[PDB]
Amino acid sequence: PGPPGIVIVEEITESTATLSWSPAADNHSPISSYNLQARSPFSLGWQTVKTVPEIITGDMESAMAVDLNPWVEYEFRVVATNPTGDPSTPSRMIRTNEAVPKTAPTNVSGRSGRRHELVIAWEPVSEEFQNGEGFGYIVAFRPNGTRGWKEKMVTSSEASKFIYRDESVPPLTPFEVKVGVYNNKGDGPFSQIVVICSAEGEPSAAPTDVKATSVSVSEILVAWKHIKESLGRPQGFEVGYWKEQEDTETVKTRGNESFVILTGLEGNTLYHFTVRAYNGAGYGPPSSEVSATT
């Protein structure tokens, strides 16, 4: 089956393009069907798309591509099949119509700041999900257990954080925090409400270099790379040990120490360990699971 000659894009919407094509030369074999294919600037390559109708039969010369994203540039091409040949030269470049944003940012977090600063951060939203011009974020926050929302219009699609300075706020005050989206077509969804402390973000990276080697038969030592402690910002570590599922024992360190010895264990017994950092905002990500046997 040869290649379709031209691909005409006839109608365009928020999430739909409708397109037709002059047929493909069947090589003495009745074309079973056509597949539609699309490519945006964010596509790694061409891909077959959902269509209307669902199957495009051999005698059809037009169909509708579905579930496109608003305000994305698409290019289309068509490929025939008989018991599957070459694809067409691509259609013109179109760009679907603008819509309201539909996709709020992920990873809404607190970061550390100055004593009386509430630092809210998030992962920005890519061009392919802004659904229109004039994309920005909307940060909304309130002391935890308070009704009125303070809000701020962050007007840069590339912004990943926002700072609020209030001296009345003592450090480590929990806020309810929302981050939403908008563009010139209007208002989008808010993220889920996260609760994050003022002044200090949770520890950001796991302990590393976690080694565990046994010491006796009642004892075994676990040690990790030392992390520097800021002044006036206490840190510690929690070490989880088990022999069974992780969900079954913890020990905390003496301030910022980078090792512990575990006593009162059983002899000739294989243990497993993970380590995570804690400060005044909570716990950081747990480390890589290590082990050793008494």
Specify the amino acid at residue 249: E
Identify how the structure was determined.
Answer: X-ray
Rg, Å, the chain Cα set: 29
Query: Which tokens in the block code for residue 28?
Result: 């003495």
> 145 — alpha (psi -120 to 50), left (phi > 0) or beta?
left
Closest-CA residue to 232 (of 285, 293, 279, 188) = 279
Resolution of the experimental model, in Å, one decimal: 2.7
Peptide bond into 189 cis (omega under 30): no
Torsion angle of alpha carbons 270, 276, 277, 279, nearest 10°?
-110
Contact predicate 10/18, CB 8 Å: yes
- What residues contact 159, with CB distance under 8 A and at least 6 apart? 124, 136, 137
- What residues contact 32, with CB distance under 8 A and at least 6 apart? 57, 58, 81, 82, 83
Breaks (C-N over 2.5 A) in the chain follow: 83, 243, 248
Q: Would you call 83 helix, strand, or coil by DSSP?
A: coil
Q: Dihedral of CA 224/226/230/235: which sign?
A: positive
- Taken in order of first residue, the domains within the chain and their CATH numbers are 6-96 (2.60.40.10), 106-198 (2.60.40.10), 211-293 (2.60.40.10)
Query: Hey, which residues does 12 pair with through a beta bridge?
Result: 17
Instruction: Classify residue 205 by burial, with Cβ atoms within 10 Å: 0-12, 13-18, 19+.
Output: exposed
* DSSP alpha helix (H) spans, the chain: none
